[PDB]
């Protein structure tokens, strides 16, 4: 399963925001996305981690950084903007032996 913490994060505009996505009992082949919930509660992709590389969908402030010797990942927003405020989550996919998606619970970011 996946967890995503802290459950609530408040930072001043311009400061970094860091969430941790933590994967339990996952295999070596990690494919992990960072998503944000829209006002309608639809998921929107922010960044992707695969191979051992993070890539942002369009904003390079969003980086997924694997932690030392863990299936734990920092989801960093560098230099936050007030309109980054919202609910975020992480999701992971395995393609073998069976297709599965796991989602973390949401975590809320407030940028003041």
């Amino acid at each position: 399963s996946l967890t995503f913490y802290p459950a609530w994060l408040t930072v001043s505009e311009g400061a970094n925001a860091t969430f941790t996505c933590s994967l339990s009992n996952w295999s070596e082949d990690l494919m992990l996305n960072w998503n944000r919930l829209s006002p309608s509660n639809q998921t929107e992709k922010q960044a992707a981690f695969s191979n051992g590389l993070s890539q942002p969908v369009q904003d390079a402030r969003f980086q997924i950084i694997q932690l030392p010797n863990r299936h734990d990942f920092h989801m960093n927003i560098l230099d936050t903007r007030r309109n980054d405020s919202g609910i975020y989550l992480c999701g992971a996919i395995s393609l073998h032996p069976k297709l599965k998606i796991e989602e973390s619970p949401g975590a809320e970011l407030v940028v003041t």
């Binding site: 399963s1 996946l2 494919m31 996305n33 309608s40 509660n41 639809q42 998921t43 992709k45 992707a48 695969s50 191979n51 890539q55 969908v57 369009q58 999701g91 996919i93 393609l95 069976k98 297709l99 599965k100 998606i101 796991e102 989602e103 973390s104 619970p105």
Partner: protein, 104 residues
């Protein structure tokens, strides 16, 4: 940068009839070099598996649509699904909702 969108996010169907569900994807991020795979997963908790009830109408894929079909809808088919597309290393998904009308 590959992404999936869901311009249609809520679907309605009567028990006994079939429902179609779809999500669209960015094709200029998908070639036949790295393959393309699509899946529908019913949300039953935090982890989703492939739906047993739905199948993929794969003729829509070259048009950038992942179109799923569930025949003979029953009440238990109600609720949220994740519409997932994978293009090589890249993947994304959207939530879709099925609303069911049951009569006698």
């Amino acid at each position: 940068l590959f992404t999936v969108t869901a311009p249609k996010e809520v679907y309605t169907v009567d028990v006994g009839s079939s429902v179609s569900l779809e999500c669209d994807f960015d094709r200029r991020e998908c070639t036949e070099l790295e393959g393309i795979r699509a899946s529908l997963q019913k949300v039953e908790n935090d982890t989703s598996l492939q739906s047993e009830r739905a199948t993929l109408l794969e003729e829509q894929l070259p048009l950038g649509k992942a179109l799923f079909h569930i025949p003979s809808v029953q009440v238990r088919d109600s609720g949220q699904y994740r519409c997932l597309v994978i293009c090589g290393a890249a993947w994304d998904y959207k939530y879709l909702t099925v609303k069911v009308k049951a009569s006698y």
